[PDB]
Ligand SMILES: *[C@@H]1O[C@H](CO)[C@@H](O[C@@H]2O[C@H](CO)[C@@H](O)[C@H](O)[C@H]2NC(C)=O)[C@H](O)[C@H]1NC(C)=O
């Protein structure tokens with residue numbers, strides 16, 4: 302006449318060519334004939350109800366009601382996280398195949414396969430600020446777990462895929478937009494370094510955002526030798 | 539008895555081959571036994587009293603006194619100014635060779651032939667915070683009169699007779715010492731701008747953080763390394 306879903310229900314079986322029909326909080330059921338399975342109804346509340354449906358009459362008739370007034374606990378064999386693209390979200394409400402996502406997972410684990418920041422990704426930590434940066438993916442799981450959010454407006458100059466020319470940060474190519482004109486460091490190493498008493502006035506140089514300076518200062522005049530879109534390093538004596 | 543000396547009194551003579559005794563204000567007399575001459579006694583006041591002594595009795599008798607009671611005025615060909623070295627100096631008392639030197643003469647107004655400042659000599663305004671400057675001298679005169687007293691220390695670098703490099707003010711070579719390490723301008727153009735497909739530069743020696751005009755054409759800044767200022771050029 303009615304029944305109560307066990308704290309951890311799984312398999313039902315409505316009596317007789319009589320069909321379960323479920324009003325639930327979210328699509329979690331997996332029905333087959335008069336039988337039905339509640340797959341990972343974690344947090345689920347509602348009712349199955351075996352209703353016969355005489356076909357000429359066209360009316361219903363509920364003959365047994367499995368009921369579940371109170372959310373379910375966990376289970377085993379129930380994943381509680383899913384990849385929304387390449388990002389993990391803790392299924393608030395599922396479910397291997399019934400995750401209801403809402404929020405990306407913060408990070409606390411170890412063995413970081415790689416991080417990903419402003420589009421480009423980084424294994425190893427040359428030249429960033431810290432290495433825990435952006436979305437980082439652990440060794441096992443195939444998706445990116447949030448760790449922090451640091452600007453990609455690193456000090457008056459911006460790291461983006463839509464950029465004016467390419468620095469190289471870490472040992473990985475990258476692209477960058479000026480967001481300013483005042484003097485400020487560049488957050489990448491130069492990409493390429495084009496060249497030109499013994500031999501008098503010899504220098505190396507590199508294209509650059511107006512007023513920004515790659516390390517290091519001139520070995521010589523001991524400062525950042527900027528002109529327009531370029532920076533120089535002189536050798537002489 | 540007593541004789542007040544004429545405004546331009548110049549010669550005196552005691553009578554009885556009798557010595558004169560010059561009780562005076564400053565040394566300006568020439569003596570010749572019973573006679574005496576007052577050489578350029580401008581401002582002098584005093585008395586020669588023609589005293590006389592007897593070998594026989596020991597009687598000493600003043601037989602005539604000449605008094606100047608009030609200072610003599612400037613007189614005739616008595617130059618009441620004298621060079622002390624090279625600096626035209628006033629004559630507080632007296633005239634040529636009796637002159638009692640006083641303060642140096644200011645530049646009242648005249649045709650300045652040459653100035654001398656910080657131990658170097660200049661005839662044109664080129665390169666100086668002004669001109670005339672320091673102490674100059676007219677053509678008719680032969681000594682320097684004050685004009686002005688600028689500091690020979692220019693925004694922290696000083697132009698002086700000794701060390702530690704030589705630069706140039708106008709036509710005239712000058713020599714200069716640092717007085718700090720803080721960045722600042724040189725008060726002078728450089729001595730020698732030694733010079734040096736490719737790139738190139740000229741350079742010259744300098745005080746630590748001091749800079750000559752001009753800024754590098756290119757980087758548009760004064761590029762001092764340490765003792766030298768550089769000037770680049772690139773295609
Ligand atoms: C509710 O969950 C199930 C399982 O994914 C979905 O049912 C399947 O969906 C399509 C069309 O409905 C069929 O091709 C499958 O054979 C269905 N299987 C069963 C047992 O019904 C259902 O569509 C889901 N609906 C949602 C999320 O709106």
Ligand SMILES: *[C@@H]1O[C@H](CO)[C@@H](O[C@@H]2O[C@H](CO)[C@@H](O)[C@H](O)[C@H]2NC(C)=O)[C@H](O)[C@H]1NC(C)=O
Pocket residue numbers: 340341378379380397
């Ligand atoms: C949810 O999915 C996992 C697999 O992704 C299921 O666990 C596996 O179950 C199989 C049998 O199908 C076992 O032999 C494996 O050892 C399990 N594999 C892993 C990786 O855990 C789990 O049973 C599923 N939940 C259900 C069916 O409710």
Ligand SMILES: *[C@@H]1O[C@H](CO)[C@@H](O[C@@H]2O[C@H](CO)[C@@H](O)[C@H](O)[C@H]2NC(C)=O)[C@H](O)[C@H]1NC(C)=O
Pocket residue numbers: 409410411412439440441442
């Ligand atoms: C992925 O790997 C992580 C660790 O690299 C595992 O997660 C840890 O699991 C232990 C116990 O199993 C917990 O104490 C920790 O909270 C987890 N975080 C740690 C220790 O980093 C996990 O086994 C793997 N995830 C799976 C199965 O996909």
Ligand SMILES: *[C@@H]1O[C@H](CO)[C@@H](O[C@@H]2O[C@H](CO)[C@@H](O)[C@H](O)[C@H]2NC(C)=O)[C@H](O)[C@H]1NC(C)=O
Pocket residue numbers: 496504505520534535536
């Ligand atoms: C400018 O470029 C040259 C060659 O491109 C640099 O040469 C390197 O520098 C040091 C000493 O000069 C050598 O030990 C390295 O082996 C050289 N490496 C290469 C790849 O040539 C030179 O140092 C550069 N000068 C700078 C940056 O001031």
Ligand SMILES: *[C@@H]1O[C@H](CO)[C@@H](O[C@@H]2O[C@H](CO)[C@@H](O)[C@H](O)[C@H]2NC(C)=O)[C@H](O)[C@H]1NC(C)=O
Pocket residue numbers: 565
């Ligand atoms: C007045 O007459 C002369 C002018 O210089 C001075 O004569 C000197 O006097 C000293 C003693 O005071 C003698 O020892 C020197 O031999 C003299 N030298 C010369 C060059 O004449 C005299 O002192 C003067 N009186 C003063 C300045 O009060």
Ligand SMILES: *[C@@H]1O[C@H](CO)[C@@H](O[C@@H]2O[C@H](CO)[C@@H](O)[C@H](O)[C@H]2NC(C)=O)[C@H](O)[C@H]1NC(C)=O
Pocket residue numbers: 577578615616617634
């Ligand atoms: C002081 O010296 C000046 C010279 O600078 C004398 O003035 C001249 O003296 C001559 C005779 O020696 C006179 O005929 C003129 O009056 C002057 N001529 C010139 C060209 O200056 C002056 O005699 C001196 N006075 C003294 C010692 O009392």
Ligand SMILES: *[C@@H]1O[C@H](CO)[C@@H](O[C@@H]2O[C@H](CO)[C@@H](O)[C@H](O)[C@H]2NC(C)=O)[C@H](O)[C@H]1NC(C)=O
Pocket residue numbers: 647648676678679680
């Ligand atoms: C050189 O020239 C100056 C400037 O002219 C002379 O000054 C003159 O002398 C009188 C007083 O002796 C001043 O009151 C006047 O300003 C000047 N007179 C004239 C006509 O210009 C100065 O005496 C001269 N110095 C010399 C001859 O040594």
Ligand SMILES: *[C@@H]1O[C@H](CO)[C@@H](O[C@@H]2O[C@H](CO)[C@@H](O)[C@H](O)[C@H]2NC(C)=O)[C@H](O)[C@H]1NC(C)=O
Pocket residue numbers: 731733734739740769
């Ligand atoms: C750097 O030195 C060169 C020669 O050593 C100077 O070249 C002269 O300067 C001007 C403009 O550059 C040319 O018109 C002349 O023809 C050049 N003359 C000679 C003899 O070369 C150059 O001016 C110097 N740049 C500086 C000091 O900034």
Ligand code: IUM
Pocket residue numbers: 318334
């Ligand atoms: O098992 U039948 O409609």
Ligand code: IUM
Pocket residue numbers: 424425426427
């Ligand atoms: O992680 U490392 O050069």
Ligand code: IUM
Pocket residue numbers: 493495
């Ligand atoms: O990329 U290159 O000379």
Ligand SMILES: [Ca+2]
Pocket residue numbers: 536537538
């Ligand atoms: Ca070298």
Ligand SMILES: [Ca+2]
Pocket residue numbers: 544546547548
């Ligand atoms: Ca007379």
Ligand SMILES: [Ca+2]
Pocket residue numbers: 641642
């Ligand atoms: Ca004075």
Ligand SMILES: [Ca+2]
Pocket residue numbers: 702703704
């Ligand atoms: Ca020198």
